[PDB]
Amino acid sequence: DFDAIIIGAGFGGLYSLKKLRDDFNLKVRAFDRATEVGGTWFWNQYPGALSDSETHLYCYSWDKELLQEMEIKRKYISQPDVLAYLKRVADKHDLRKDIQFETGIRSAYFDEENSFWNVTTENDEKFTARFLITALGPLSSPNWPIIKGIETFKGELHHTSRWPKDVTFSGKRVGVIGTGSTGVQVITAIASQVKHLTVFQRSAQYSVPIGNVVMSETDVAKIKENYDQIWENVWNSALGYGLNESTLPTMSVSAEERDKIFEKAWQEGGGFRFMFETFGDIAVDETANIEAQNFIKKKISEIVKDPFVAKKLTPTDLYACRPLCDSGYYEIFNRDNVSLEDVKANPIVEIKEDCVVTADGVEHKLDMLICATGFDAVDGSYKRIDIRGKDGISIKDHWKDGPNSYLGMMVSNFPNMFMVFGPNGPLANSPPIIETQVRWIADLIGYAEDHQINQIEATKDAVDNWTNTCSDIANKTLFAKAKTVYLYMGGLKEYRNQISEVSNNNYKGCLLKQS
Ligand SMILES: Cc1cc2nc3c(=O)[nH]c(=O)nc-3n(C[C@H](O)[C@H](O)[C@H](O)COP(=O)(O)OP(=O)(O)OC[C@H]3O[C@@H](n4cnc5c(N)ncnc54)[C@H](O)[C@@H]3O)c2cc1C
Ligand SMILES: NC(=O)C1=CN([C@@H]2O[C@H](COP(=O)(O)OP(=O)(O)OC[C@H]3O[C@@H](n4cnc5c(N)ncnc54)[C@H](OP(=O)(O)O)[C@@H]3O)[C@@H](O)[C@H]2O)C=CC1
């Protein structure tokens, strides 16, 4: 028996464990398939892996001594350094003694008689707990491209999600399929290391410089001396990225003024900075969105000296989402050892023992093929567990059409289960989201223990209520004319207001059962 079982030992699961064990004195065990803490920062060790958030904000805020001890080496933080940070958190707070590593959870079945969860590992070990905390992260299974003959390739074949140690690039012909955030990071990191690089691009996206520079001891001292105000700014913001979130309409200033504002953000770096510190309506007004696109289009044409390559890199969609972030991506395509293939116009039709074949019949001979082709959607990690709630309803069937929840944390028919960084949550920097959710869930569990209530479940109506306010906010946005509602788009501050009103009003929308 435990009071709570936690699935996952990334950012989300580690603070869940700290909060429930040490602040609410509950008996807790966490599980992870990994051999070490860190979650996605343990699993994802591909070349160029880098935070989107600046280093001083991509971390916990709840341990003030840890903040003052923070290593802030560069403006953004690389994967080995995030992993080392989370390892330090687990060291300082004695967390691993209550984490069972190398242990996958195969099933969790709710026992309506006892009002607790029966949790079974992949090695048939059974544990019981009143509450189930699912901290599964935003990514499900690695998505491989479905291409005839991929199994015949005899060279090195790697998905970015399983990047092996000891990979060497010198002298090799390498291909990369995929040009999302991970593909851009990999391509930028390895182009100078390989004999030849072929990029297989299905859809060009916009990318802005990230501006990753070293941090002087003075830069760092200025942050740490003001850290309380910095976090207060996070909690009162929509995105939690430390931005000065603009209200200025894009088309309310002159062309010369507009160019200077975009250039300012371009030089300082960051994708959210470009989209939301410049002007206030780029995600809302079609004309504003096109102006932002055209700024980046002009940059691509200036950086990439061959205009035919520049055209291939230039996105074609009418409206644009938030741009990627890079450390020298477009410059890569000026190199003599880089070839860009548009596989919308010239699709991949076959992989053979030594090559990728495109529809023009060209054999692209490769020593190594890197699939930066992404992951299944967030609800996949839930459906990959055999989770059965009331009446034995499985989460696979409950979410057959997509995920739906209350506040991003509670699922109807699944009592005493609480999601951390689950579907239908806010779009903001993730550590502040996870801290917000862990603290709300722990307060709810604490109120349960005080009031002797043993079953907490959100109602069908509350879920539909949450789905509607997500739909209503999203429909003021361009993001239907671009690439169930997966995200609450009201921002971090309003999300915290939303869940504060629920807890202040006796957990409206939650069925509470007393024993
Ligand atoms: C390179 C990179 C940069 C990023 N930068 C940012 C950024 O700047 N800002 C931002 O907001 N987000 C960013 N993200 C995304 C987000 O911050 C991370 O996904 C975040 O660390 C998620 O933490 P988590 O604990 O919620 O999930 P994860 O770190 O994904 O941890 C989930 C864990 O659950 C375990 N698990 C799952 N199913 C089971 C099971 N059945 N049994 C046992 N264990 C299981 C997994 O093994 C995994 O270890 C970035 C992601 C990457 C890859
Ligand atoms: N640094 C990071 O990696 C971070 C990632 N994230 C999130 O993590 C998730 C994963 O990012 P990423 O790993 O880049 O995965 P993405 O899904 O974002 O991009 C996948 C890439 O592979 C291409 N692709 C997929 N299938 C095929 C195919 N069959 N043939 C050819 N090309 C294909 C896609 O092209 P198309 O566009 O045509 O499908 C796209 O270019 C995203 O949701 C991202 O927002 C968030 C923060 C940081």
List keywords for this structure.
five-stranded parallel sheet; 515 residues; Putative flavin-binding monooxygenase; 2 domains; monomeric; monomer; alpha/beta; Complex; FAD/NAD(P)-binding domain; 17 helices; binds NADPH dihydro-nicotinamide-adenine-dinucleotide phosphate; binds flavin-adenine dinucleotide; oxidoreductase; eight-stranded mixed sheet
Q: What is shown here, in short?
A:
It is classed as oxidoreductase. This protein has 515 residues and is an alpha/beta fold.
Describe it.
- The PDB classes it as oxidoreductase.
- Keywords: Complex, oxidoreductase.
- It forms a monomeric assembly.
- Structure of cyclohexanone monooxygenase mutant from Acinetobacter calcoaceticus.
- The protein: Putative flavin-binding monooxygenase.
- It is a single chain.
- By secondary structure, this protein is of the alpha/beta class.
- It folds into two domains: 2-37 and 95-141 and 376-514, FAD/NAD(P)-binding domain, CATH 3.50.50.60; 177-371, no CATH class.
- The protein is 33% helix and 20% strand.
- The chain contains 17 helices and 24 strands.
- Strands 1, 2, 5, 6, 7, 8, 19 and 20 form an eight-stranded mixed β-sheet that branches. It has a five-stranded parallel β-sheet with strand order 9-18-10-11-14, with helices on one face. It has a three-stranded antiparallel β-sheet with strand order 15-16-17, with no helix packed on it.
- A hairpin with a 4-residue loop joins strand 16 and strand 17 (363-365).
- Helix 1 packs parallel to helix 15 (430-450).
- The longest helix has 21 residues, at 430-450.
- The protein is globular, with a radius of gyration of 24 Å.
- NADPH dihydro-nicotinamide-adenine-dinucleotide phosphate (NDP) binds next to helix 5.
